[PDB]
Amino acid sequence: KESAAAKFERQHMDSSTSAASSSNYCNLMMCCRKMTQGKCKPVNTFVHESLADVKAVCSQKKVTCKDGQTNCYQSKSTMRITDCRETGSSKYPNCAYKTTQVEKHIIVACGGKPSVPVHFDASV
Amino acid sequence: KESAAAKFERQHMDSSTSAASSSNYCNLMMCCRKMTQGKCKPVNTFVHESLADVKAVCSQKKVTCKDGQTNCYQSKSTMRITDCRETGSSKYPNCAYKTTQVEKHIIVACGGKPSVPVHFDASV
């Protein structure tokens, strides 16, 4: 049972100098998208192009995945993405990430039917 | 059990959001602090001062609670806070919030032993 004090802290406390900062984007997103449960996912990329443009990659340039599987595709154009990588000081359950906004081609694995993105393989 | 397609969206898509902008603080925080589950909590305030400072409010000016309860306190000084308000175009489970930074006196209810904040009542 969550205690009242912990509830107040969860719902109302965000002690900081500039919490709304974009340097904080990854810390908040990785938390929100549930990638910090039990351990910090060490690296994760978020894509900012439309969901339609990303799905479109599944019929663009075919490439081999980093793991040898052969169902990966590389986007024809660069896309705006946010790279999230643990800081040299992040320790669960206080995961910490460095936010890096860049534009690069993305490589995703496509599967299912219709064939759609099911895994983020890499950015180049 | 989440579909592969959906997992990719959760872990890698962020196309409908001013991403790393300050305007996005509330959307990410309400999500991260779990106030958007089963229903979007319509209104919520986050305090940026230190936990000690907020706890210290429990021993400042007594004021009545909005609900008639008597364990409410008002901070002697203003505190930097953020107001998160569900926007007209928000529809669960796609909760959208408006972020507004202000510096005001806060009013919290205190409980337990030792007496610590257990409810955010308002800001004045």
From Swiss-Prot, chains A, B:
Disulphide bonds annotated for this chain are C26-C84, C40-C95, C58-C110, C65-C72
Top EC class, one word: lyase
Q: Name one GO molecular function term.
A: nucleic acid binding
Q: Which UniProt keywords apply?
A: Allosteric enzyme, Disulfide bond, Endonuclease, Hydrolase, Lyase, Nuclease, Secreted, Signal
- What's a GO biological-process term for it? defense response to Gram-positive bacterium
Query: Deamidated asparagine occurs at which residues?
Result: D67
Q: Give the shown range, full length included.
A: 27 to 150 of 150
| Function summary | This enzyme hydrolyzes both single- and double-stranded RNA.
* Protein name (database record): Seminal ribonuclease
Taxonomic lineage is: Eukaryota, Metazoa, Chordata, Craniata, Vertebrata
Catalytic activity reported: an [RNA] containing cytidine + H2O = an [RNA]-3'-cytidine-3'-phosphate + a 5'-hydroxy-ribonucleotide-3'-[RNA]; an [RNA] containing uridine + H2O = an [RNA]-3'-uridine-3'-phosphate + a 5'-hydroxy-ribonucleotide-3'-[RNA]
Which coarse location class applies to the principal site listed for this UniProt protein? Answer: secreted
What switches its activity on or off, per the activity regulation note? Answer: Allosteric regulation by both substrate and reaction products.
Write out the annotated subcellular location: Secreted
Where substrate is bound, by residue? K7, R10, K41, P42, V43, N44, T45, K66, R85
A GO cellular component annotated for this chain's UniProt record is: extracellular region
Enzyme Commission (EC) number = 4.6.1.18
Known tissue expression: Seminal plasma. Can reach 3% of the protein content of this fluid.
Q: Where is the active site?
A: H12 (proton acceptor), H119 (proton donor)
Q: How does it assemble?
A: Homodimer; disulfide-linked.
Q: Which organism is it from?
A: Bos taurus
The record's similarity note reads: Belongs to the pancreatic ribonuclease family.
